[PDB]
């Protein structure tokens, strides 16, 4: 009730892990996405697990498709990658009522450039300037030198594909 | 490492930053256009200046990536759109002067008046004072005064400026490796580096000139029939073998003969198909209209409007406290925001206009998934062509019967059909020789084929021969009559209005073909036809990411503009005109004029 109802979520590039281990979740019907890749939701509540981790962040509506194994793009390659053998669930719901203000909420950020793709469950919060040209940047922006992080602009009038969505990813140890 | 990869990265940065700044400008421009206040107009200018400054800065950075070293064409296109030099390539002295001319010419047209000789205090502007006369006066001398006094007072001011305007523009085009400023303008149809879709700049001349030849018969018989009917309204002044007096054509220039319907209506005593009464009698509102419009596009397989549209669009006049701008606009703010601004009223013209503007949204929505720089019509003609065909189908009594605005007991007699078809031709085919001739003049002026001491001569030589219109008062080179039109003094291309028309009817034939339409092309309704919707969608989704030739070919199956669909639309009128002209000369003589006597 404090990882789902938190009045602010983390930026996708700096996603927050919080260990949930301590059905009614899945019978809420207020979740826009509940896609599991290990076992059916009604089952895991009666299954054997030792560690349950909740990785939570906010992304665009169009980008929720990327929170899944095998996906590619900006969010998958550069922010939060799920492994092919992922055993867990992915939950998302529309957060326009909370994470979008009339002036425009630029608080949430994401990583736009990176030299290489993130490995599964890797996190990168480095603000080191991306070098796109042969000449090195030496820590200043300019021609062929871009600050890697970029800001999400969420307005209450934005389209659904551009509205903010709160995402929670459950990871299970799945002992054997 | 490669320049293409660098350009790929630069555009990736652009597309994300541009989408935001544009959406900021879009929100501010919206607030002003819906609530005209000193606060909202100051925000609109700041947001615009930010978007503009960003655009100029990106354009300068974009040139640092030479497109001579880029192969990915959808990238080469985006870079091409950014690094447009324009007047940057001119000297800073000349650039300063060219902009001074442009802003001077604009303000002469907009803030220039002429006072009538009878009362020196009641002075009239083109809008609304002079345009009201040209669109409602039946007096030969009143019309003559307004037509002449505008071209003599305001026009002569613009003559020395337009002469300077031609020189500086041509230096700007030769520096940009074009041949003349008209060649620069024809670039908006160019396509290079695609097998079988290349379209040279000089090709646009050949096509327009050859496609116009096939309109000449229909225009002559229309022109004959109008000069006939005008001889009844203005008895003594028109000759049945001569051109038409320019000040008698319904507007200030004879661009549209739309206003001549009251005098040229074939069967005047039959009513017009106007379901305005029928809508009010069923208590329709703007909501019901846009629902039916939304319902129309869904019937062919297109999505219904997003909930943002229904929640944010201005669909009525917001009272009298706050003032909007009811000029029907269809907004593509970005970030998935789509809106129609319209002070809708329960009429038929608005019902049609709603289908027209929603078609603009449909086009805007279908390419929204394209990169930012490629969210636009395939060319300058495509967007209005799409919006117009949505009013063609919606207007037919077939469609009006489908939705209950017309009783299934309707009489579609040949007479009201021709009444409507004549009304159409006055606007649609009337402007086609006008638009052609006006651009062809500029095309020879920019190329140097018309010396400065023959501007006004060659102007009326072609107004006589091509348009069939003659000046009521002779004009030497102290005049500049083409500059008396908005699109010429305000530096805008004009051939877009010719192509937009031909494109419009190309789409409508191909869609009504896929829709298995039986009878003539002018009674067609593409509603409930998913084959037509798909055939249209495969062009809308493209935006301007592929050559306009291919985008056109996705609808009609051919890679080039064509006019025979337009003629096919008007062919029932063509025969009726041919029959009513048996007792009248068809064609004109370029020698009769009212002033020479
Ligand atoms: C069924 C359920 O879990 N409801 C909770 C509610 O108890 C809580 O107060 C709120 C956050 O304040 O989030 C939701
Ligand atoms: C053009 C056409 O046939 N439109 C039909 C309409 O007549 C009919 O009332 C409606 C419901 O059946 O489906 C649609
Ligand atoms: C150009 O780059 C885009 C980048 O997304 C790619 O999708 C496209 O296939 C490229 N075009 C080529 C290689 O012809
Ligand atoms: Cl975020
Ligand atoms: Zn329009």
Residue numbers in the entry:
A (entry chain E): 339 to 360, 366 to 519
B (entry chain A): 19 to 615
Quote the authors verbatim:
A remarkable number of SARS‐CoV‐2 variants and other as yet unmonitored lineages harbor amino‐acid substitutions with the potential to modulate the interface between the spike receptor‐binding domain (RBD) and its receptor ACE2. The naturally occurring Q498Y substitution, which is present in currently circulating SARS‐CoV‐2 variants, has drawn the attention of several investigations. While computational predictions and in vitro binding studies suggest that Q498Y increases the binding affinity of the spike protein for ACE2, experimental in vivo models of infection have shown that a triple mutant carrying the Q498Y replacement is fatal in mice.
A significant enhancement of the RBD–ACE2 binding affinity relative to a reference SARS‐CoV‐2 variant of concern carrying three simultaneous replacements was observed. Compared with the structure of its wild‐type counterpart, the RBD Q498Y–ACE2 complex reveals the conservation of major hydrogen‐bond interactions and a more populated, nonpolar set of contacts mediated by the bulky side chain of Tyr498 that collectively lead to this increase in binding affinity. In summary, these studies contribute to a deeper understanding of the impact of a relevant mutation present in currently circulating SARS‐CoV‐2 variants which might lead to stronger host–pathogen interactions.
